[PDB]
Amino acid sequence: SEPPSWVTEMLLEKELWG
Amino acid sequence: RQWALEDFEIGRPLGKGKFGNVYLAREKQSKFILALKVLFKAQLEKAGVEHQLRREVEIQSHLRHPNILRLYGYFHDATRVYLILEYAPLGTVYRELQKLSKFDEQRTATYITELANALSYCHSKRVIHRDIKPENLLLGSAGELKIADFGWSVHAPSSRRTTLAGTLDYLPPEMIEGRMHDEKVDLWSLGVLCYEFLVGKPPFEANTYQETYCRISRVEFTFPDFVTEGARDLISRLLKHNPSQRPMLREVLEHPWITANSSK
Ligand SMILES: Nc1ncnc2c1ncn2[C@@H]1O[C@H](COP(=O)(O)OP(=O)(O)O)[C@@H](O)[C@H]1O
Ligand SMILES: *C(=O)CCNC(=O)[C@@H](*)CC(=O)O
Ligand SMILES: [Mg+2]
Ligand SMILES: [Mg+2]
Ligand code: NA
């Protein structure tokens, strides 16, 4: 249910600055 | 037999895991020194990764190889799961790399030999590790490398896998793109390690996850000039976008750079 850490971080980057 | 916490003396934390610490331990009757890996049940359940722990236990329990860390048993109480592990006294390769900055060619080739021996055994059981980064590589009393932490591993007897797994810097294109993958993912990670061991940084390192992802998918990396021609040859062959172009582990063990520099 939790993705690998890097998936979560890369999604943050997308939400933060596109 | 039926282990319980009362069967062990506990000592200092050896390192910090995602779901709990790993502690120095001693089985009371034998006085034998071990490691107890603790996982908090509520953490596990919240993260929904119970299947990773089941795979870790089911797979690592049955592996027996000098370069694979042994998992002797397990138990649980009201709040925690405990894995009883072989103690690795010399710590992680991660810490060694931090201490030395980079490894010379003899040390690197020896680790790669031991890693390839261990992965050969895994792949003969059709097990794929998928997370062989330096903080999961431990060192025994004679400085010998031991692959640990099988929580991302899988037993892939026939079918190809599609799980998003592992740690970005060590993953091949087919795994970060969520395409089908097979045991060749570990060969790519072996190339990342060989580079990181010689250089001190993994080859696709970037300050954003997005750029690291793009560098991996397009095999965008370069060699510093002190990396010798033989090491470049091995690493370039391992870091091929096409999984089937990556060498077999037998070919790694036979590579002239490996045999000229490994003490193993
Ligand atoms: N058997 C062991 N002997 C010595 N140190 C260990 C052992 N197992 C784990 N460690 C230390 O604990 C850290 C986390 O262990 P690990 O099994 O990788 O947890 P996680 O699955 O949460 O990453 C390792 O990086 C290492 O520093
Ligand atoms: C999210 O899906 C990110 C996709 N990849 C990139 O943005 C990498 C682009 C690049 O650095 O060339
Ligand atoms: Mg780990
Ligand atoms: Mg793990
Ligand atoms: Na680093």
DSSP letter assigned to residue A4: P
A1 interaction partners in chain B (CB closer than 8 Å): 47-49
Instruction: Name the domain boundary from B35, B70, B86.
Output: B86
Domain total for chain B? 2
Q: In the numeric block, which tokens belong to residue B28?
A: 């009371």
Tell me which residue range forms the domain holding B135.
93-261
Residue B16 sits in a domain of what CATH number? 3.30.200.20
Q: Which of residues 17-76 of B touch A (CB under 8 A)?
A: 47-49
Please give the biggest Cα pair distance in chain A: 25
Provide the CA B5 distance to its chain's centre, in angstroms. Answer: 27
Is B3's Cβ below 8 Å from some Cβ in A? Answer: no
Q: Is the dihedral of CA B205, B242, B247, B138 positive or negative?
A: positive
One DSSP character per residue, chain B reads: ----GGGEEEEEEEEE-SSSEEEEEEETTT--EEEEEEEEHHHHHHHT-HHHHHHHHHHHTT---TTB--EEEEEE-SSEEEEEEE--TT-BHHHHHHHHSS--HHHHHHHHHHHHHHHHHHHHTTEE-----GGGEEE-TTS-EEE--GGG-EE-SSSPB----S-GGG--HHHHTT--B-THHHHHHHHHHHHHHHHSS-TT--SSHHHHHHHHHTT-----TTS-HHHHHHHHHHS-SSGGGSPPHHHHHH-HHHHHH---
B159 and B255 fall within a common domain: yes
With a 6 Å cutoff on the Cβ, whether B87 touches ligand 1 is yes
B97 and B70 fall within a common domain: no
B121 and B16 fall within a common domain: no
Q: Name the residue at shortest CA distance from atom 23 of ligand 1.
A: B17
Beta bridge partner(s), residue B154: B128
Rounded Cα distance, B120 and B195, in Å = 20
Pocket mutation for ligand 1, best pick of B36, B38, B149, B167 (most atoms within 8 Å of C-beta): B149
C-alpha torsion angle, residues B50, B54, B56, B57 (rounded to 10):
140
Q: What is residue A2's three-state secondary structure?
A: coil
Q: Which helix (H) or strand (E) holds A1?
A: none
B106 and B149 fall within a common domain: yes
Q: Name the residue at shortest CA distance from atom 13 of ligand 1.
A: B15
The bridge status of strand B71-76 relative to strand B33-40 is unpaired
